[PDB]
């Protein structure tokens, strides 16, 4: 018999390359559009007594 010769050792992974950057994450808009209005009307009351 002979002894097994040294095995090929594994290699450490290269490591994930990361791009740095700035981000803005947008979501679907569910808020209603809001604005200001003015109602002009007249309450008309006819009372039969």
């Amino acid at each position: 018999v002979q002894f097994e010769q040294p095995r090929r050792c594994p290699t450490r992974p290269e490591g994930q390359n990361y791009t740095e950057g700035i981000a803005v994450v947008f979501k679907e808009n569910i808020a209603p559009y809001k604005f200001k209005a003015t109602m002009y009307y007249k309450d008309v009351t006819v009372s039969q007594v």
């Binding site: 018999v1 002979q2 002894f3 097994e4 010769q5 095995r7």
Partner: protein, 48 residues
């Protein structure tokens, strides 16, 4: 005579250690009830 290493019986002094990497997993979006479903659960919608 002459021999190769393959022609000789091989015994190992090495202790085995089989380490495997944890595999990449993807999480899909998942909701029990969508917000549309929750809105629709009401019997009467005042706006409509």
């Amino acid at each position: 005579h002459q021999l190769s290493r393959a022609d000789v019986t091989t015994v190992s002094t090495f202790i085995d250690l089989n380490i495997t990497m944890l595999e990449d997993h993807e999480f899909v979006p998942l909701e029990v009830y969508t917000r549309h479903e929750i809105k629709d659960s009401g019997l009467l919608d005042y706006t409509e």
